[PDB]
Amino acid sequence: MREVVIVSAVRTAIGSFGGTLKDVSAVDLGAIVIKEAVKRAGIKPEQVDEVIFGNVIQAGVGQSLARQSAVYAGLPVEVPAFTVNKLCGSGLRTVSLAASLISNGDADTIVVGGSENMSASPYLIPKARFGYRMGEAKIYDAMLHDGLIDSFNNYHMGITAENIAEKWGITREDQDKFALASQQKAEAAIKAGKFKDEIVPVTVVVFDTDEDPRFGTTIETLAKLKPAFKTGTVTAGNSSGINDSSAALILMSADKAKELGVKPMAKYVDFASAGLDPAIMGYGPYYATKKVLAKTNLTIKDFDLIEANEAFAAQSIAVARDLEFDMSKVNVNGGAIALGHPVGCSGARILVTLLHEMQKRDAKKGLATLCIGGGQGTAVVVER
Amino acid sequence: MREVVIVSAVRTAIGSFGGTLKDVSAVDLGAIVIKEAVKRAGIKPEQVDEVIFGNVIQAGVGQSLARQSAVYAGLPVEVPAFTVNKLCGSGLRTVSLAASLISNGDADTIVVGGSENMSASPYLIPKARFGYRMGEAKIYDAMLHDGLIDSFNNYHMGITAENIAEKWGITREDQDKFALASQQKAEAAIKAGKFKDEIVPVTVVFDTDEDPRFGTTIETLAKLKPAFKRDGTGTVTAGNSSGINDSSAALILMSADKAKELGVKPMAKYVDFASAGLDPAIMGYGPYYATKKVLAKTNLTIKDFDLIEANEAFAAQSIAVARDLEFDMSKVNVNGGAIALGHPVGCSGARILVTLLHEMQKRDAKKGLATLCIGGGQGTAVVVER
Amino acid sequence: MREVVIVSAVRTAIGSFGGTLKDVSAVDLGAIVIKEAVKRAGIKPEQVDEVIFGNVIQAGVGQSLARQSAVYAGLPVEVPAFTVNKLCGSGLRTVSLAASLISNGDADTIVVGGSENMSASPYLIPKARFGYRMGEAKIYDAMLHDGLIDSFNNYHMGITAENIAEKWGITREDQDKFALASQQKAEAAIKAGKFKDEIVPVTVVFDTDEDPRFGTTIETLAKLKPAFKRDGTGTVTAGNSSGINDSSAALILMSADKAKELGVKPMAKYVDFASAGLDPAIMGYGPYYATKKVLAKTNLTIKDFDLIEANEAFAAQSIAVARDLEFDMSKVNVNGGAIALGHPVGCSGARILVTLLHEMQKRDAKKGLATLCIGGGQGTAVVVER
Amino acid sequence: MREVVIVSAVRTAIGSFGGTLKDVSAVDLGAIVIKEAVKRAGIKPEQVDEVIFGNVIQAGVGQSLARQSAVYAGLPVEVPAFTVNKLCGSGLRTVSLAASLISNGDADTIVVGGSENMSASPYLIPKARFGYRMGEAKIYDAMLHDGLIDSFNNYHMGITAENIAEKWGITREDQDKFALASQQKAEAAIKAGKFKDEIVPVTVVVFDTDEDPRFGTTIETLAKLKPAFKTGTVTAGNSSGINDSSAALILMSADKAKELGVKPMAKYVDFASAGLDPAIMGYGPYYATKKVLAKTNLTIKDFDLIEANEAFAAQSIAVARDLEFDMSKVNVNGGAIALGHPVGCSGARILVTLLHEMQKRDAKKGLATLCIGGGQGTAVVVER
């Protein structure tokens, strides 16, 4: 093995569904963050060995996004690239993969991250090729069909949250209280400038501020909302949204960062992925996190900051209780309920957020983890 | 770093465009080969640590194919999985990635491969969400738009074959002759039983590659019309291109340590890989750069390979590559290649490796190369050794 | 008021669903029959004063079919035209309308008829304009949505046939026996050359009705499964319903005065018409009301007709009608009906009239009735006389 | 022959494209005006003998609109109905047809008119049935494909106006001056309440006022606009719009109006239709009007009011010059440039407008005429 470091990390502000980044392609969002990450690391484009990038709703983006974003970022055509799809886990799995390839000597410098434009995703017509012959037929929303709908059970991932709420005893009030605190933390962090260092502006009008948060959210406001997916408890107010954004990081061997005089943001320690019953996919962080702790001989007390993606309050609460998070150190600047869940990006997005806040607080150790549609979880530990 | 071995390798026969596997989903084809791969390895399902699988035209297959296929194959829900898209390279990149992960200690046993159902791929309506407002618009073929059309130049990958025929001076006749040999070798290989070991039956009982055109003659090929250009300048035809096809393939890589512990007799040792980028406009030449690079990593030359699988996307790109890497053509695609057999994009990279390993065993061959060009301007390669 | 005569009558043979005319547009089929109708009348094109033509599934045919067909048929651009949509009734309503116009002095010579290409009809995307925003949606078959599904009940017109089989107590066996006779008579009529005079060839050389199922037996019909209900309650099948079909038909009506002036020998005199509405849920019974009404206008009874064409949309509705109007069945659909020949919706009403006039001439018959049921809950009828 | 009278006439306000009537089906608009026309004539529903109704973009309205609108209007199911498609001429051709049927003794009472919702029209996928096999394909806008595009020449009807502008020497300035006067007349008529008697409200918010007119239009505003269809001169400012609306009238034999004590609004005199070269379809009113004058032994001087549909300024100007209209008596309350052109309705719409203004002015004779896509024109003369 060899030591791996993270040398730069950047993200766009997160667009709302049908919002300010609705007409900026996933490809273009990826290009902006790849270019900017290279700039921030102070290396040459030619120094990148590979690009590994998340993208989940691939329908209609054209050939393999990673390759497109790399070239339009201005990396040489000589740089090879591939696209990862681990659903919600995509952006964060690019990180661990890269660290493994560098550790094993297969590369020195890899650009990682993820891009998703859920707004711009198309509809699908399954039998346009050989025809329907007779009778009405269904067109599908690619973002749901290839993303947010569990393919095994053919229900929304919202139902997986209700399953967890039921099975873990998580009340509507608890869910809404969790949501409120995400909105509160997010509004305070935005106005306090916490995200200024990590965000690259996009000109569409200069878009530089996360727009999904609902400032002034109250417990009463949340309480009014109707369950969105079914007896229900999971609403659009206590669930992440549908969003458009990208994020990029650069991993390097400690060897090559030294040679080039590149100052690392943090050390990559390790990762873990786990599968579990699709019907409770939201609990996957439990298994992932446990595994990475057994690999690293660590404990939850050893983390100064935790980014745990907030797909749904119900799943986040279940995770937090069973890993026994200290919630003072979780998602300190807000989480996905407020900020958004651009599926193929989020995993990298939360790592970008973690790293910059780790710097501001001079934290030692850090955990990023999130649930994955179809029944998975993945986690990464960093240290400074 | 640790040694990595290949313990099993299996594929479906390759369906034609709108042919016998047109209604078996990419997901189901993947399950079949993942299932059989595990069975052939003599391993329990719970032994698998991860599934890394290729799938290029992902429109309408549902959530990430790798996880769906792994679960429908009977692998425990505890096994994590993800889907790789390096276009035509996908299936072979799953192999090199898994090797790096096992070598780095991040796993002991990984299922890899790829599945593509090009026939079942949908059309797309880009502005159905917020509306077209007024006037005509276009719906797109997912297989072309997300696969076989170069997204930088917005022309078909067949034009890249044309760009290469122009710059390397590869005539229509040279292309047709390469295509005839590919058809001849596939016919003899099929009739000689060469594919019987590696193919797993699919009851729709489909067990024979159906895209080959038995009795192909040079005159046959000369009658066909340029498929991508017309206007006089064309040389690439349906007869000297790979087809559009539906198939899956799977392999199991394992640390040498874990193999020995379990008493699994490996098929072969994984040696190394390389990937390279180049000008998208001549993407077909990617094997050259990828092969030169893996050769340098392994300290081998082309003479060292008993058997070579170089994927036949287009005769025009395969000829440029063979010339510039100075292949001994008697050792290349000995059982026929994609012109004859087909090019199920996300599967092919794994497919050619299963074909290579089986021929290597038949021949007691010592060293093997699998390489292929990649839409967008890339190439990847893997060396194996027995 | 003035006398109106029919001077020419012609149809294409009837194409099957996805059959030989599937790629000849409704517009082109209309041009063919309008062309030949004029030629058969021995009239110059410039003699035509108006074209009134039927077309039901208008989605994607372009601007108003009547005008397109009239111009492509070589009629002067000066000839005005419009398209009638009374669903299944359309082609026959063009006839009665033109008669009223000529009788009222608003024209001397009118081309009438209908054209339907059901095979070539498109699908619809209702919210493509302003967008679906989120989630699954439906695309609709134009032929069902704008034709064969009752828009008030949103069930298929086949259910209306089921409603009638229930209320009139018409068994599956009665339906199958009516269907067998229709298949028998069409086979004999075709082989006897009965359709040779009225049919105009279309080179795609299509000149023979292709929907009939020669050698139909009662056992054949009994094997088929209910097409519209299932759940046990079904009796209406593909074998005892009309099909989905593609064809055109045209006729030329003229004042008796203008006919004599020009020396045009008429085929027949137009007598009168009636149209009626009823409960959409039993739309198939519309002929009863329409026929009772035209009988009252003309002071005739059913016994007075030598020949009857009652369109066979569904055996179930045709049996109810025949019973309640007390038809002499030996005089009905003597050359077979729509179960055998097909139901190209916007054409059929004209089609059955061309078939009637030709048989009337063969038989030197004196009086004739053409009637058919209409989706939405209507019926229309026309009496003619030689 | 027998005398025919018009006993009632009514229309909805005309919706803008994507405007207030975008989600009120053509069927429903037809039902509102049929019901209201019956009410205004003071007859029973059972007294209607037949419904003949215009509808041009039929794609996706379901089975034959005339029949649907009749039943949902509350006319007995016993009433027979059929739908006419003479493109732009549809609504007015229903009138003449009906008068012929009544004159000939085939009916006593016919409801006529037209309904078009252009907004709600769908897109078309030609080969969904037997499939596209491979490669991109086109979806079509039904309103253009089955309506506003000349099927012979495969160009917009806008090009037919440019053809006329070129061939008749009609300048951009002349076109824009014509447009301005339509807007001016329309704004004045609306604010003056001229349309209050003829409009039936629709609750969607009570919609009762034509919304397409652009109040405050200036010659300078028009002059700024860019040609819309090609050297060009025809803009969206000097062309009718795309619109949603319905209109209904009731024709009766003089015999039956007498029997029932129904007070007629006017006498139907006669009509004419004409075909001409599709490429100059806008000039069809010339031929139509000439023919109806030869039938009625009348002259343009004999009309106290003229409604000449304003498809395009260029065609309207050409028509007006060659028939030598006195433009003081044409479209006195504004025309389609301001008000809109709901294709299947317009022909009936202009007759509704004509009749009510004929009443207000106590005019004796009246002409309604309009051009028809695909190369036609149609005209009707009424008298009080």
Numbering used by the authors:
A (entry chain B), D (entry chain B): 1 to 204, 211 to 236, 240 to 393
B (entry chain A), C (entry chain A): 1 to 204, 212 to 393
Provide passages from the article that reported this PDB entry:
Among all r‐BOX or RBO genes, thl_1583, which encodes β‐ketothiolase (MhTHL), is identified as the most critical enzyme for the carbon chain elongation mechanism in M. hexanoica. Therefore, MhTHL is compared with other well‐studied β‐ketothiolases (CkTHL from Clostridium kluyveri, ReBktB from Ralstonia eutropha (Cupriavidus necator), EcAtoB from E. coli, and CaTHL from C. acetobutylicum). In addition, we postulate that the properties of thiolases determine the carbon length of the end products and that the high n‐caproate production of M. hexanoica results from its native thiolase.
The THL from C. kluyveri (CkTHL) was selected as C. kluyveri serves as a model n‐caproate producer. The respective thiolase activities were compared by inserting CkTHL ReBktB, EcAtoB, CaTHL, and MhTHL into the platform strain E. coli SK‐1. The strain containing MhTHL produced more n‐caproate than the strains encoding other thiolase genes, reaching a final concentration of 1.25 g L−1. However, the strain containing CkTHL produced a similar level (≈0.9 g L−1) of n‐caproate as MhTHL. The overall structures were relatively identical, with alpha carbon RMS distances of 0.50, 0.62, 0.53, and 0.46, respectively. L87 and V351 in MhTHL and the corresponding L87 and V352 in CkTHL modulated the pocket size to a greater extent than the valine and isoleucine residues in EcAtoB and CaTHL. In the case of ReBktB, the protein contains Leu89 and Ile352 at the positions, making the pocket larger than CaTHL but smaller than CkTHL and MhTHL. This corresponds to the n‐caproate production results in the platform strain SK‐1 with altered thiolases.
